Write a protein that binds this ligand. Structure first.
Ligand code: CMP
Ligand code: CMP
Ligand code: CMP
Ligand code: CMP
Lengths: 384, 384, 384, 384
């Protein structure tokens, strides 16, 4: 769009004023050559009220400048020129509508602008000396960053009672600002990148107690390695415990957008209409299995239907001998447990860290009854 | 009322003593013209015990003043005059019975009062010099705020062993107070305005993981925009997960007070007695639907009765053609699913971010059986 | 007992050594008159190993003293005399087996002892001057508390390269200790008195959102006043949500100890055996009702039996007229709903913030069937 | 393995460069005798790219050294020699793949290396003086640790405008680093050893409220002593509330590995196949009972089967007289409640803090029906 360029340009204009207006307060030698750059900035700043898509904007937009330094408006009553900086609140509020920027750019940039302003103010109540403005500005900012950040050298100290009063309030405000921002950043880096901080402690607690006990090396592996698979394939995250709070039509939408891998590639899941993909993809619950891991033994009960998405798993006999075959992508098994109401003849292991989807049984038999075509689709692969 | 004026006036009196009594300790030149303002303050402070609707009040109310400085009661035994400031505990406790004031006014104001008192105390053990009291007070407060806030210039340093002992304990206590208050405020601004801090992180976690995955732009919208609707219409808040802990008669009262919009404007909900509004307004569960969002397809099961409060939704045929009509405020639909025990003929979308109330079915059929009049009221709109 | 006196006396002995041994290192003028007080302390410290009801105790108990300063054991090899202070670990561990003391006395006392020790150490590598030991000790502790607490005056600075090396490590260690303890206390006062901090925020969140909405003044009261009743009678606390984690025999024991008020004062609950008081006092669930609050209307269903412990409640007719009677302490009602299987004729309000116990119905009818005597006890008051 | 030695040697090489390269920048007198030790380090650093099991490694591996100081490559363009230290990111990332090291060695070691580097840099923009390099290095590091750790002596101050500019940015960066690391460590020690910190507060809350009430001394004991048994035998930990998040095959594996004590030592649990130990060891729920604690009275209902692992419990009559016998390790009781469908004749107490396993009943009767052999194994001990 084009309006973001307008926001960044008005931001630049407000920074221009925040750097220049205190300098013009201290140095009346300015504002004489800058009048074109001042009138353009003033017209830009006054041409912003009606763009809604208001007190600070109205207070800053009144043309108090071009008069403060022209009519020369003596110093005790010229301190009302600072009301032009109240656009800081508006721009900080709008900076959210554009932890990297909430408490980072709104804090260190504010600290720098405030430091510049207060160094210029501390420059103002000094006796008129004979030194270059640049080196005096560096010295003033040096003293300012010394007392604002709580260092305390003391090579520059107040001498007049009015400067001693000013240094009381600047000491208080600066050590408040320093402590505030530093404590905020310290409490925020303990929240920054909250995925590695929360998840790694999730691993720490479990690991800690299982290593308080003693566990075999071939079970020490696959524990830290299941956390590694959940750290690399899933990046420290289970899914369902975080997706309850998202609404029911929103679990429908997010789940049909995300679980696009399992559906419309196996002949069961392609061409299966639409009331499935809303009804069952929320019930589509994934699990992860490691290498050489058993699920069923010979003839157990409650053997739900196993939908393999990717990965190859061998099927063998009840014993280790007489290799049957390989089952791989694009197919499924596990179905003649409930449709045939019969005990089972199957043995399963896994080659590697395989992903397999495990859905419940009562909803399965509830929904297959409402659909002759796809229960028949199950049925030919059941019978042949 | 009038008693709050009495609390603020006694607060002013205690501040008056906290500022003045150390000054009279250091400067015996006072207390001579202030005797009217001292007797009125003393009578006001002693006329507060019986107003219950007690150790600090009794200890402060004893007339030790008007004698400490009259009989002149030499300095080592005059330090018991400080027992009059123990009303600080009482006023700080009562300040709750009147995070903007719990750890803000009880901390910075306490810091300022303590700073004044300890600067006056540090003034006390100085050699008698020849300087104005005002500039010496500013210098003493300057050194105090220098060492209390941990800056460390060093232009003013102790010289006598007794002053070196006093500066040990004031250094310890001041750096304790500084660290305490600054760490408290730093940990409190991470709790201050806890709605934007908690909710924005609620958005952050979800957004973070859904953007760790990749989601379509027309589904990137309505996610952040559902959070925007929950941030502007609801201000970052779901309702039921926070209202369990409120008691059952209190969910009755709060819910009948709050959900006054849905009831007594549709002819179902007006004139419907009272045992409804207690029985069902807790079961009145709201949901939000975005533009162009489906709910039902053609003839599904379990189509509960839809109560639309505000907003207009179109009804069309099973296909996109042959526009039926507009359904809008003041009415309802969704009813012939359970009363007629029949499949459905309806298609629904939404124009915008519409609010719709979704209540359960088993309680509905439980309560409609106990009420002939209002099930009949449902029935004419069902039949005609 | 007597052994706690022994622990406090050995604690005093360890403090005696921690204060005195560095002084004897710096000042060899000591240890000459203190030999009785040294031999008694040594015999007390060596007579502590066998009292189990061990490395630091054994390392401290070896008689290296009485030889370090007698044979004079030149200074570079005399630094092993500090191994006697390792009883600090043992006493800090035992201080739990005796937030007011876990991170308070183990931190500020440790800071003070460490400060004393390191000030004496900084005294050790100084050129031999001619000043009183007291004022030099105050000056050394002054510099120490200046650099340990990060103040930085600079009136005392290192001059020799070895003192510059020592001040590097003491600066590092002292600013580590200062930051550690101050951040710990700042994070602990945000946990200190965790009942007012957790509960008041519990009130804050609810109050905040109900005042984000608008609620009537006669419902603004009884909300904050129900929190006041839960803050004064219960002190910010519900009961059952915290007593699940306590085990089942332990809910039996704690509940029969605590709920001694409701039982054995009404004729139902006295003389009722024992298998009740274990079976039902966990199911004894309390609720609180405010003034003038309705529960039932005329003839509703599911009117469980109401056990009033204390407080008087009026019973009136279905309308406001024809006052029936007062029901008060020592009795109960609510019973002919389930035993007679009949609709109800009752109206109830409450005079004030009354406490009433509400138990479930299925367990009630399960247990009354196993007990003829007490269901009969219910029965006469039901029938007469 | 051998590759960890390679990582520690390359770590030593990177530390060698981080200490030496700034010194060679400041002191061109080096690099002349070190050429063998420089060529070996360079060949080691360039022989690390292909060992995957990449921008910093490639940028550091380019042979910019051996030319920077040979061709003498004048000072303003020689600052690109610092790009060799970017292996810090790689080694800090790999330090996790090898709270004692996450935010401890990555922070204090980084602080020390940064301090050395910035002290050498501050040495660089000094006028050429005539002092030994060692004492000047100590003085520079002294000033650096003074301003980096926010102490502020002031014996060494900048004089040139360029040094004043450098001290502005080093003051800012150093007080940022100091505050960051110290606040991080302060917030981490409140998380460090999170077992004693979390559990002791678990004890604190309960103890606090039960001591807000008043509880008998023989019930004050066994409360703190049940927490002591859970603190010494279990180390502040219940089991099931933390093992839900571990997956179902993983509760199978972890539970069969951990609960190896109860199984295969009583004749019930040995030789019982395998589908038990997966089916019931997750349902194997442990409880702890203290001395002299009742469970059943005479003839109650729902007396599940009691599996005693270790400890001896007496059985007596319904009254205190006529001692029956001792029941001890290797056996079980509690079985004729459900198999015989009969009321009970038993009384039980406990000698000490005994561990007993309590499993549910519906799964027990569900699984015993599928197993004739082991229900018969139950049956002979039931009948004889
Ligand atoms: N001849 C065969 N060789 C290998 N696998 C088979 C064979 N016949 C059937 N199967 C699969 O083995 C599975 C075991 O029973 P299921 O119900 O899981 O579904 C079964 C089929 O998918
Ligand atoms: N002729 C019509 N045109 C538009 N809407 C209708 C018409 N007749 C009924 N409806 C509504 O359409 C809804 C679809 O079925 P419901 O049970 O939800 O309730 C129905 C009625 O409220
Ligand atoms: N004559 C009466 N006057 C006042 N209260 C009564 C009278 N008779 C019965 N009650 C009580 O009124 C209660 C209303 O029905 P309950 O089942 O709650 O138990 C009833 C009795 O305890
Ligand atoms: N003669 C006996 N002396 C002691 N204990 C017995 C005797 N006979 C049975 N028991 C045990 O007492 C227990 C009480 O009933 P249970 O069903 O718990 O299982 C019973 C047996 O294990």
């Amino acid at each position: 769009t084009y309006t973001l360029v307008w926001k960044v340009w008005i931001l630049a204009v407000t920074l221009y004023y925040a750097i220049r207006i205190p300098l013009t307060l201290v140095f009346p030698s300015l504002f004489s050559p800058l009048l074109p750059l001042d009138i353009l900035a003033s017209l830009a700043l006054i041409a912003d009220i009606p763009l809604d898509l208001r007190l600070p904007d109205l207070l800053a937009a009144l043309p108090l400048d071009l008069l403060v330094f022209a009519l020369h408006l003596p110093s005790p009553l010229s301190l009302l020129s600072l009301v032009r900086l109240l656009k800081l609140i508006s721009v900080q509020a709008s900076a959210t509508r554009i932890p990297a920027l909430l408490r980072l750019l709104s804090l260190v940039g504010f600290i720098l602008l405030a430091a510049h302003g207060i160094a210029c103010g501390w420059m103002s109540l000094q006796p008129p000396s004979e030194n270059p403005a640049g080196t005096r500005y560096l010295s003033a900012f040096y003293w300012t960053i010394t007392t604002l950040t709580t260092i305390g050298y003391g090579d520059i100290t107040p001498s007049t009672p009015t400067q001693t009063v000013y240094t009381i309030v600047i000491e208080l405000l600066g050590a408040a600002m320093y402590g505030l921002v530093i404590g905020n950043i310290a409490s925020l880096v303990s929240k920054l990148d909250a995925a590695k901080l929360l998840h790694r402690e999730r691993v720490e607690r479990v690991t800690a107690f299982l290593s308080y006990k003693r566990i075999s090396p071939e079970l020490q592996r696959r524990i830290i390695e299941y956390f590694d698979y959940l750290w690399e394939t899933r990046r420290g995250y289970e899914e369902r415990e975080v997706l309850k709070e998202l609404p029911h039509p929103l679990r429908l939408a997010v789940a049909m957008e995300i679980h696009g891998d399992v559906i419309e590639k196996v002949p069961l899941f392609k061409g299966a209409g639409e009331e499935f993909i809303r009804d069952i993809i929320l019930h589509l619950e994934p699990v992860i299995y490691g290498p050489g891991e058993y699920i069923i033994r010979a003839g157990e009960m409650g053997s739900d239907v196993y939908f393999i998405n990717r990965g190859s798993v061998e099927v063998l006999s009840a014993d280790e001998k007489t290799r049957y075959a390989i089952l791989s992508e694009g197919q499924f098994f596990g179905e003649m447990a409930l449709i045939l109401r019969a005990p089972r003849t199957a043995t399963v292991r896994a080659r590697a860290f395989c992903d397999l989807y495990r859905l419940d049984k009562e909803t399965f038999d509830r929904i297959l009854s409402r659909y002759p075509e796809i229960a028949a689709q199950i049925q030919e692969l059941a019978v042949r």
